[PDB]
C-alpha cells in the first residue's frame, strides 16, 4: 500500500520536524495535510536509493528508512535537462514533494521536498525566489551557498538559504538523502541552474 507507506512517511516527517527547533522556527507543522491519492512515477533514482540510502544517526533512521520503503510509491522529479547536469547525474539523483501545493499530501502552509543524490555528484549553483531550509536525513555532503562559508553537513544538521541567493552542493563518497522546507515570496516555484 503506497497509501500507508506515505502515511508512515509523514509521521516520520512530523517528528523529525518536532525534533528539529530549526524546522521549528522556519515554520509551523500544518494542521491541515490532506492525502492527495498522488500516483507513483519511477525514476532510475530508486533502485541507488535503496542500495545505498547513506549512513543515518540513531535519530535520522527511522525517517531514512521510511524514506527508502516509500521510494516505489512516490512521484519522482528531475527537473533539469541533460544538457544542465548530464545522464549520470540524472541517473542518480531525483527529488518529489512530499507535502504542499502538489505533495502526496497537500497543504498551502508549507512545502515539504526530499531530494537523494548518489556519491560524487556536483550540482552547481542553482537558485529560487522562495527561502530553503535544507535538512540532511541520512549520507553527507558538501554545501555551497553564494556569500557565506562552505559547510559539510551530516545527518540532523540544517542550514538556511535566503530568497534568490544562489546554492550548490557536491557529494564525495557517500550519497545524501534530504529533507527540506520551503517559505515565503515565490513559495512554489522550482530551482533554476544559475546563469
Ligand atoms: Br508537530
Ligand atoms: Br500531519
Ligand atoms: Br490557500
Ligand atoms: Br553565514
Ligand atoms: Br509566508
Ligand atoms: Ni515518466
Ligand atoms: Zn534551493
Sequence with gaps: SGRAALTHLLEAARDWHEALPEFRAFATWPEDLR????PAHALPVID???????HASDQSQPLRDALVAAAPHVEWRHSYTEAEVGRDFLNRF???ELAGPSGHFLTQSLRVTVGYWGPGLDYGWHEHLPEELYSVVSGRALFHLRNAPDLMLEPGQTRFHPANAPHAMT???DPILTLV???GAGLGDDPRMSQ
Design 35 to 38: 492525502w492527495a491519492d498522488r
Design 48 to 54: 541507488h536509493l535503496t542500495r545505498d540510502p547513506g
Design 94 to 96: 531525483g527529488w518529489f
Design 171 to 173: 557529494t564525495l563518497t
Design 181 to 183: 522546507l520551503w517559505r
